[PDB]
Every structure is written in C-alpha cells, then in structure tokens.
Amino acid sequence: AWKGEVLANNEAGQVTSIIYNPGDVITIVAAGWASYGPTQKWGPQGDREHPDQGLICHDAFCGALVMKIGNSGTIPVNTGLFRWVAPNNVQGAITLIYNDVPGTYGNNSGSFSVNIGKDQS
Amino acid sequence: AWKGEVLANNEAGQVTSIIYNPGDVITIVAAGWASYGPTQKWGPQGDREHPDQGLICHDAFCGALVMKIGNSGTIPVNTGLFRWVAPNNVQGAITLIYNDVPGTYGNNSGSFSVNIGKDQS
Ligand SMILES: OC[C@H]1O[C@@H](Sc2ccc3ccccc3c2)[C@H](O)[C@@H](O)[C@H]1O
Ligand SMILES: OC[C@H]1O[C@@H](Sc2ccc3ccccc3c2)[C@H](O)[C@@H](O)[C@H]1O
Ligand SMILES: [Ca+2]
Numbered sequence: 001a002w003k004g005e006v007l008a009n010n011e012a013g014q015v016t017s018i019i020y021n022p023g024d025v026i027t028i029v030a031a032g033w034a035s036y037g038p039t040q041k042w043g044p045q046g047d048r049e050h051p052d053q054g055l056i057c058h059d060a061f062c063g064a065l066v067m068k069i070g071n072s073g074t075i076p077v078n079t080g081l082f083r084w085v086a087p088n089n090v091q092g093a094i095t096l097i098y099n100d101v102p103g104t105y106g107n108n109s110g111s112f113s114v115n116i117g118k119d120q121s
Numbered sequence: 122a123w124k125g126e127v128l129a130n131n132e133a134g135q136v137t138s139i140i141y142n143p144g145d146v147i148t149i150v151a152a153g154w155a156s157y158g159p160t161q162k163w164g165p166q167g168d169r170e171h172p173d174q175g176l177i178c179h180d181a182f183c184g185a186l187v188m189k190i191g192n193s194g195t196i197p198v199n200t201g202l203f204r205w206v207a208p209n210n211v212q213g214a215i216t217l218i219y220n221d222v223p224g225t226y227g228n229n230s231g232s233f234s235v236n237i238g239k240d241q242s
C-alpha cells in the first residue's frame with residue numbers, strides 16, 4: 001500500500017510506490033483541499049464550475065486528482081476508486097497529478113492526502 | 122460489499138447492507154455532488170466555508186458525507202475511509218447520512234454514490 005501527499009503546485013506529479021500490473025484490482029481514497037490559484041479551495045473532485053482551458057486531464061474538473069499509469073494518458077481519480085481495474089494494456093508506476101493547465105501550476109496551493117493499496121484479485 | 126446512492130434530502134440517512142462487526146476492516150469511497158440548499162454543489166467533503174449551525178455531525182462540514190454505525194453518534198466519512206477500523210465498542214449496521222441541520226433537509230438536492238467493502242484482516 002502507498003500513502004503520501006500530492007501537492008497541487010507539483011506540476012510533474014507525485015510518483016508513488018505502486019506498480020499497477022495486468023489483472024490488478026486497486027482502491028484509492030483521496031482527501032483534502034487544494035486550489036489552482038483562486039483563494040477558495042476544492043476537494044479532489046475539483047471545481048465543477050470551472051471551464052476547461054487545456055487541463056492535463058479533460059475528463060475531470062480543473063483542480064481534481066488525476067493519475068497516470070506508466071505511459072498512459074491521464075485518468076481521473078477524484079475522491080478515489082473502489083476495487084478498480086485499468087483498461088487493457090495500461091500498466092506501470094502510478095503517478096498522481098493535480099489537474100491544472102500546463103505551465104499554470106505555480107500559483108497553486110494545498111494538497112491531497114492519498115491512500116492506494118492493492119485488493120484481493 | 123454494498124454500493125448505492127445517499128440522497129442529500131434524506132434526513133433519516135441511507136441504511137446499507139454492511140453490519141460492522143468488532144475487528145472489521147472497512148473501506149468506503151464516496152463520489153458526486155449535492156447541495157444543502159444553495160445553487161452551488163459540493164462533494165462528499167461538504168462546504169468548508171459554511172458555519173456549523175447545529176449540524177448532525179460537528180466534526181464535518183455542512184454538506185459532508187457522515188455515518189452512524191449501529192447506535193454510534195455520527196462519524197465523518199467525507200470522501201471515504203481507507204482500511205479503517207471503528208473505535209472500541211462501535212458496531213452495528215452502517216447508516217450513511219448527508220450532514221445538514223435537523224429539519225432543514227427538505228431543500229436539499231443531489232446525492233453521493235458510495236461504495237463500502239470489508240477488507241482482508
Ligand atoms: O484554467 C486554470 C487557470 O485558472 C486561473 S483562475 C481562473 C479563475 C476564474 C476563471 C473564470 C473563467 C475562465 C478562467 C478562469 C481562471 C488560475 O489562477 C491559473 O493558475 C490557472 O490554473
Ligand atoms: O446551515 C444549514 C442551513 O443552510 C442554509 S444556506 C444558508 C445560506 C446563508 C446563510 C447565512 C446566515 C445563516 C444561515 C445561512 C444558511 C440552507 O438553505 C438550509 O436549508 C440549511 O441547510
Ligand atoms: Ca494554477
């Protein structure tokens with residue numbers, strides 16, 4: 001199991017200890033308050049009211065938690081994922097990333113606290 | 122496991138299948154949008170800006186997901202709980218509830234999708 005913080009201002013992402021492999025079932029729970037700039041903060045679902053202007057993930061609100069698995073595109077994580085299996089051919093190290101516009105990360109603040117573990121399979 | 126919706130306007134809370142027994146290890150994941158009345162919606166964490174005007178759970182924000190296990194007082198769930206063990210002597214059916222002020226539930230809208238699973242122990 002892995003546990004740590006994912007900083008909203010961490011553009012490159014927060015590498016984890018978790019290597020997702022074919023057939024794996026995983027659960028993720030994410031918690032906390034972050035911002036992409038505005039003083040207000042949002043949870044790991046991000047800001048539902050916020051237009052998308054080149055977000056690193058277009059399948060999640062600006063300011064949501066997303067991930068990458070190995071070489072995959074971005075994948076929404078949001079509040080977490082319960083007993084979850086990746087699409088085909090998706091595998092490798094999980095990297096957790098705060099969803100904002102490339103280059104805009106520097107005014108960001110707050111972080112999420114995230115747990116990830118493998119489930120029975 | 123149990124999966125289901127917890128309606129924001131359900132002041133009595135949503136009874137689940139899960140009976141928490143001493144020594145259980147459980148995981149909950151909560152997703153989605155709900156409102157305690159206002160036009161905006163908030164996730165399972167609630168509204169960090171709204172003051173507590175007599176909420177059924179004083180340890181979570183207005184609009185957060187909380188629960189009752191058997192005869193316990195309300196316990197914060199928020200976005201969820203990772204491989205979590207109840208406090209000494211806490212046991213019984215898990216009821217999921219939207220955190221609002223008693224009797225002010227009628228103007229609530231939306232819901233949370235919640236998964237609960239028992240973990241290996
Ligand atoms: O798209 C994210 C960007 O949003 C702006 S705020 C901001 C607020 C309200 C807005 C309303 C409409 C359009 C853009 C808006 C941008 C952040 O400060 C910036 O760092 C970047 O992350
Ligand atoms: O605190 C829970 C209550 O919040 C109000 S919103 C609202 C907005 C601004 C306010 C300003 C002052 C005092 C209460 C206020 C309540 C809801 O409409 C009501 O149904 C109940 O859930
Ligand atoms: Ca930003």
Ligand SMILES: [Ca+2]
Pocket residue numbers: 156157158221225226227228229
């Ligand atoms: Ca209300």
